[PDB]
Amino acid sequence: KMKIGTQNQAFFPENILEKFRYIKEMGFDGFEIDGKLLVNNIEEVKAAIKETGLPVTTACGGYDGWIGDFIEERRLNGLKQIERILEALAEVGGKGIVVPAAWGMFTFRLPPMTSPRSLDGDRKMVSDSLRVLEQVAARTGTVVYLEPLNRYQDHMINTLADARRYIVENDLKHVQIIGDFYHMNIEEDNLAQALHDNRDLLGHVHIADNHRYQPGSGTLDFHALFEQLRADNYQGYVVYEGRIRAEDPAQAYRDSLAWLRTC
Amino acid sequence: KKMKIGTQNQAFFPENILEKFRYIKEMGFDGFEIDGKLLVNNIEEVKAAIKETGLPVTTACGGYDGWIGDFIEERRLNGLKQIERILEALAEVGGKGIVVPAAWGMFTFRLPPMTSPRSLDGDRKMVSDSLRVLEQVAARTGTVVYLEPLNRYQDHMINTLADARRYIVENDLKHVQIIGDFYHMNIEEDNLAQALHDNRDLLGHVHIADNHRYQPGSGTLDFHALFEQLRADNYQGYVVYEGRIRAEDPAQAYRDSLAWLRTC
Ligand SMILES: [Mn+2]
Ligand SMILES: [Mn+2]
Numbered sequence: 001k002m003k004i005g006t007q008n009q010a011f012f013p014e015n016i017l018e019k020f021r022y023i024k025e026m027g028f029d030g031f032e033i034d035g036k037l038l039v040n041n042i043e044e045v046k047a048a049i050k051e052t053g054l055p056v057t058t059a060c061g062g063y064d065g066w067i068g069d070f071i072e073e074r075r076l077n078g079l080k081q082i083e084r085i086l087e088a089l090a091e092v093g094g095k096g097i098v099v100p101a102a103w104g105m106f107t108f109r110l111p112p113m114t115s116p117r118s119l120d121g122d123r124k125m126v127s128d129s130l131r132v133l134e135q136v137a138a139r140t141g142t143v144v145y146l147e148p149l150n151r152y153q154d155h156m157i158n159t160l161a162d163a164r165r166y167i168v169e170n171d172l173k174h175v176q177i178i179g180d181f182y183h184m185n186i187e188e189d190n191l192a193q194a195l196h197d198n199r200d201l202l203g204h205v206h207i208a209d210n211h212r213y214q215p216g217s218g219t220l221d222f223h224a225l226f227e228q229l230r231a232d233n234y235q236g237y238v239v240y241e242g243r244i245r246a247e248d249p250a251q252a253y254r255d256s257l258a259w260l261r262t263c
Numbered sequence: 264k265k266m267k268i269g270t271q272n273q274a275f276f277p278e279n280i281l282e283k284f285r286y287i288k289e290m291g292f293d294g295f296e297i298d299g300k301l302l303v304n305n306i307e308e309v310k311a312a313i314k315e316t317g318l319p320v321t322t323a324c325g326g327y328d329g330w331i332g333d334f335i336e337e338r339r340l341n342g343l344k345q346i347e348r349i350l351e352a353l354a355e356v357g358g359k360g361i362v363v364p365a366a367w368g369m370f371t372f373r374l375p376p377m378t379s380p381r382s383l384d385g386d387r388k389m390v391s392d393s394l395r396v397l398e399q400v401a402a403r404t405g406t407v408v409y410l411e412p413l414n415r416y417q418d419h420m421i422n423t424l425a426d427a428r429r430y431i432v433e434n435d436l437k438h439v440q441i442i443g444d445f446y447h448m449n450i451e452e453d454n455l456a457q458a459l460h461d462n463r464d465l466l467g468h469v470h471i472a473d474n475h476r477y478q479p480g481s482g483t484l485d486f487h488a489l490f491e492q493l494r495a496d497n498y499q500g501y502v503v504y505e506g507r508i509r510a511e512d513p514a515q516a517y518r519d520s521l522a523w524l525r526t527c
Contacts, residue, residue: 104375110416111368152374152416186450187475190483211451219454 002226004207004260005030005057006240008037011249016041020048027257030055032239035062035085035097045092056094057237058145058204059085066102067129068122068156075125079132086133086142095236096143098178098204101126101156108155115155122156127170137174145178145204150186158187160194160202167201176203181220182242185210192228199232207260208242214256217245223263264494268471268524269294269321270504272301275513280305284312290514291521294319296503299326299349299361306352313356320358321501322409322468323349330366331393332386332420339389343396350397350406360407362442362468365390365420372419379419386420391434401438409442409468414450422451424458424466431465440467445484446506449474456492463496472506478520481509487527 006028013019016037023031033056038045049055062085065071065078085097101122106115115122133144146163148154157163163177177198181191183206188194195202209218216222229238246252270292277283280301287295297320302309313319326349329335329342349361365386370379379386397408410427412418421427427441441462445455447470452458459466473482480486493502510516 107374107416110371110374150416152371152414185474188483189475189481210449211453217453219452 002229002260002263003029003237004239004257005032005237006253007032007060008034009244009249009253011244011253016044017048017051020052020054024052024054026254027261028054030057030237030239032056032058032060032098032237032241033094035059035081035088037062038092038094039084039088042088042091049092056089056092057239058095058098059089060098060241066105067099067133068101068105068126068154070105070117072125075129079129082133082144083136086136086140086144089142090140094142096137096145096176096204098145098147098206100147100149100154102154103149104153106155107152109151123166126156126166130166130170130172130175134170134172134174142174143203144175146175147178147180147206148183148187149180150183153183158183160184160188160198164198164201177201178204178206180206180208180241181222181225182206182208182210182212185220192225195225195228195234196232199234202232202234202236204236205229205234205238206241207238208240211245212242213245214242214252215240216256216259217252222260226263265525266490266493267293267501268503268521269296269501270517271296271324272298273508273513273517275508275517280308281312281315284316284318288316288318290518291525292318294321294501294503296320296322296324296362296501296505297358299323299345299352301326302356302358303348303352306355309356320353320356321503322358322360322362323353324362324505330369331363331397332365332369332390334369334381336389339393343393346397346408347400350400350404350408353406354404358406360401360409360440360468362409362411362470364411364413364418366418367413368417370419371416373415387430390420390430394430394434394436394439398434398436398438406438407467408439410439411442411444411470412447412451413444414447417447422447424448424452424462428462428465441465442468442470444470444472444505445486445489446470446472446474446476449484456489459489459492459498460496463498466496466498466500468500469493469498469502470505471502472504475509476506477509478506478516479504480520480523481516486524490527 063081065074069075327345329338
């Protein structure tokens with residue numbers, strides 16, 4: 001039995017309590033919340049968790065400035081915002097925040113082809129951000145989940161092994177890996193083997209099918225990967241992150257979850 | 264049952280055309296997919312190398328400045344003139360056709376800037392006009408245009424085999440066929456084998472790489488299952504390496520991947 005959560009989707013109710021109710025009745029085990037929605041509505045979120053029993057598992061997004069941002073002022077402002085998100089997560093019982101090195105800032109694979117910063121420059125800035133967030137995570141009892149993205153979305157961290165290097169070489173104790181099936185389907189040599197080899201640091205999982213749409217609408221072998229997580233005694237959640245391609249979005253979402261329950 | 268397996272050029276290949284053809288043949292490949300500009304500027308050298316080695320030019324790819332769906336009209340039109348010259352060169356050396364996407368590296372809906380400067384209907388009109396024009400050249404020269412869907416990050420216009428099929432069917436084109444690329448398909452298709460099957464009437468060419476764009480066998484793509492689908496569908500084209508190499512010894516990894524691929 002896997003614990004299966006979801007991020008927000010546009011067809012979810014806007015009202016926080018109704019949103020939690022709606023997510024619960026679809027069958028999900030948890031909610032991965034936007035960081036700014038969480039910080040700006042802490043008490044509403046706490047109430048909704050209490051009334052529904054649907055927990056906030058994690059936060060994702062909600063800050064302006066990547067931990068590996070090219071612009072130093074933006075990186076530092078982002079760290080201040082991520083600190084607030086971690087504080088809010090502790091107040092509602094969330095486990096941690098999902099962050100990539102960056103999104104949509106640069107890629108080696110599309111023009112402009114030349115990075116404005118050296119590889120050592122990338123590593124120093126990401127490492128410094130993670131060292132700072134390690135201090136906040138220790139204070140708040142939370143974790144930073146470091147997410148490799150595919151090569152088009154980020155140049156710095158593309159594989160689980162990339163994230164592992166940052167964690168191990170900085171000897172971080174409050175930064176874990178989050179593997180995303182969609183990005184892994186592009187970047188990993190062997191998805192199940194990557195989950196296994198990193199079971200010591202894999203703290204969170206994102207799921208979507210190979211084309212980023214609802215699980216089951218593509219051909220990712222969710223049953224095989226779930227079996228790998230079971231064999232490794234995976235403790236965390238698997239959380240929907242991605243898009244919906246369907247005439248009836250809500251029905252396709254429910255059907256995907258029902259199908260995942262048989263994996 | 265055995266497949267015809269070719270390759271594009273790689274940086275470690277010899278630069279001299281005759282040596283390059285010799286080298287590719289010796290690694291065991293069945294054909295060469297040549298850069299369009301290399302071909303056009305060296306037709307006689309290429310003809311000599313085909314004759315001496317027996318290694319055919321199967322197709323061309325690249326070699327023109329201006330996408331068939333280019334945002335800039337002058338670039339689109341200049342590209343068509345260059346693609347025409349490439350199709351003429353292919354006819355002279357016995358190649359079958361040219362591989363083109365709608366565009367590469369021009370725009371994507373999935374990365375900033377998020378808003379396209381052109382409407383969807385504008386995209387369709389420009390790509391369709393380009394394909395009509397090339398259809399005329401293909402009819403004259405006895406060649407084919409292989410229309411390649413790319414993944415959503417490389418191109419906004421044509422991402423699935425069904426996208427390319429639309430363009431071909433709704434324009435009633437007879438000299439434009441689909442080229443499926445395993446790497447792009449692994450991102451975009453609902454079901455890769457099914458997509459190859461449902462489009463077997465228009466699938467004229469195939470690009471192969473593993474899921475992370477590196478040499479076949481270094482990732483997780485089930486090449487045996489996909490080659491079986493092609494065989495079941497009576498596919499008679501080539502499967503051509505397009506992609507990158509990650510290895511300490513690139514030449515050896517290239518040989519090893521092809522040797523392994525011969526068992527699929
Ligand atoms: Mn993710
Ligand atoms: Mn290709």
